[PDB]
Amino acid sequence: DACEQAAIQCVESACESLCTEGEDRTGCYMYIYSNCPPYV
Numbered sequence: 001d002a003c004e005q006a007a008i009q010c011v012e013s014a015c016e017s018l019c020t021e022g023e024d025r026t027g028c029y030m031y032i033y034s035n036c037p038p039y040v
Helices: 003-008 012-018 024-035
Strands: none
Touching (some): 003 012, 003 024, 012 024
């Protein structure tokens, strides 16, 4: 497992490469998108 782990790394592209799309990405990407700069 890695999708969520991608978001841990604070890289939008990590979720993109890892997580498929249309939920898998969303959960991951939403984290970064509300945790990582330049979003937070």
